[PDB]
Design a protein around this ligand. Sequence first.
Ligand SMILES: *[C@@H]1O[C@H](CO)[C@@H](O[C@@H]2O[C@H](CO)[C@@H](O[C@@H]3O[C@H](CO[C@H]4O[C@H](CO)[C@@H](O)[C@H](O)[C@@H]4O)[C@@H](O)[C@H](O[C@H]4O[C@H](CO)[C@@H](O)[C@H](O)[C@@H]4O)[C@@H]3O)[C@H](O)[C@H]2NC(C)=O)[C@H](O)[C@H]1NC(C)=O
Ligand SMILES: *[C@@H]1O[C@H](CO)[C@@H](O[C@@H]2O[C@H](CO)[C@@H](O)[C@H](O)[C@H]2NC(C)=O)[C@H](O)[C@H]1NC(C)=O
Ligand SMILES: CCCCCCCCCCCCCCCC(=O)O
Ligand SMILES: *[C@@H]1O[C@H](CO)[C@@H](O)[C@H](O)[C@H]1NC(C)=O
Lengths: 269, 98
Amino acid sequence: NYTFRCLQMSSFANRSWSRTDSVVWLGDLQTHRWSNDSATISFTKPWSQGKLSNQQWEKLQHMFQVYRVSFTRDIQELVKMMSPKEDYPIEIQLSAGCEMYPGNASESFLHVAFQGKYVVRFWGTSWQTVPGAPSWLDLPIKVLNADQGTSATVQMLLNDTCPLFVRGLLEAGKSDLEKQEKPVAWLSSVPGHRQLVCHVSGFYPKPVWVMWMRGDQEQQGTHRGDFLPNADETWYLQATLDVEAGEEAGLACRVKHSSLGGQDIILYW
Amino acid sequence: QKTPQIQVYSRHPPENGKPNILNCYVTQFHPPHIEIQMLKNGKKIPKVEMSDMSFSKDWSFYILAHTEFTPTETDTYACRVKHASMAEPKTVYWDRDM
Ligand SMILES: *[C@@H]1O[C@H](CO)[C@@H](O[C@@H]2O[C@H](CO)[C@@H](O[C@@H]3O[C@H](CO[C@H]4O[C@H](CO)[C@@H](O)[C@H](O)[C@@H]4O)[C@@H](O)[C@H](O[C@H]4O[C@H](CO)[C@@H](O)[C@H](O)[C@@H]4O)[C@@H]3O)[C@H](O)[C@H]2NC(C)=O)[C@H](O)[C@H]1NC(C)=O
Ligand SMILES: *[C@@H]1O[C@H](CO)[C@@H](O[C@@H]2O[C@H](CO)[C@@H](O)[C@H](O)[C@H]2NC(C)=O)[C@H](O)[C@H]1NC(C)=O
Ligand SMILES: CCCCCCCCCCCCCCCC(=O)O
Ligand SMILES: *[C@@H]1O[C@H](CO)[C@@H](O)[C@H](O)[C@H]1NC(C)=O
């Protein structure tokens, strides 16, 4: 079940300074980037064009190129219109894409946050404010909905382009999406109760099991940390256990991960 | 305005004198404007690589910085973050285990 997420981050500091940067994700892998500094979208994977021909990709990119300039001027206009109630600095974020299922695969979304708060979505055939959003958004959204052409394009992109493109991506990026990288683990602790730490790094895909054991008995105090990214598209996770000094003996950290194939890592303290 | 969290950890098991990569993962902050440095003995490392900034489901931003490094037991390493949510830079030291 993969989610394809196009994330836009736009910052408007004043009338003479703004930037828009985007990143695109397929599951936990980055597939595109588009810096304010670049004229065109960059592939971050060899397969990032999915199954689109050179021509279809160029058309889609031209649309995004026009959109980036238009978006910028639109927000500048929305501020002029709504000011002083809403003035700089302004942060706007857009999260758009689709999630693929079995059979006929998809649900699309386009959510918009203003100053870090979710306020607007595209839904059905038009933009709408979400319940609880500030009333000053009323006129800007009516003004935005008056653009029937944009609405038609957004509906197409979400309903048709996004799932088709993503089907092609999943196909073309199959080997990477299914790559297996092996975790490496190591133990440490800080010195009367000791906190024991089992570090596991370099695994891909994300699902993993890590647990402190004493023989076959699971150590219930095992506390799993957050999944942390490495720069090389693998993961890092640590698992800790509070113990009494002179109790570490006998303890072991066991690691199960799909890339190991039955050869679990078991590291004895 | 959300204050950044900082986690510092190595790519591989830290072995003294062996080249490695140290990561500094900065998360849960807003607005996105931020300055991140990685330090060796309190001194800025010039070669630091930064991931593209992104944001989570809750709309808070995150970024990964990393740099090549060789642990020893004579050098300290840290990540230092300047953000509007804090009146002073926050430095967090690599704890030599992580
Ligand atoms: C992209 O995909 C989205 C869905 O995510 C499509 O959105 C739908 O668009 C259609 C038609 O444009 C809408 O259909 C209309 O529904 C009306 C009732 O809407 C409510 O009720 C339904 C449940 O029944 C809810 O799902 C919905 O959210 C609303 O609460 C009907 O009253 C309409 O009937 C009237 O109009 C038609 C002509 O348009 C006449 O034939 C009828 O006799 C009648 O007068 C109509 O059926 C639908 O509501 C939209 N769905 C949602 C969820 O909003 C986009 O159309 C699609 N775009 C493209 C280009 O593919
Ligand atoms: C982000 O990119 C845009 C578009 O390339 C830049 O916008 C231009 O800014 C210049 C100089 O300040 C203006 O004179 C132009 O009119 C702008 N062009 C358009 C079409 O928007 C912008 O400067 C970039 N932002 C940053 C902070 O570097
Ligand atoms: C409304 C977006 C639906 C998705 C349409 C398919 C586009 C796939 C290509 C991804 C590159 C887009 C880069 C982000 C551009 C932006 O949002 O500013
Ligand atoms: C606008 O914001 C930028 C970015 O912080 C700043 O450098 C500049 O001085 C500001 N003032 C104007 C109106 O140019």
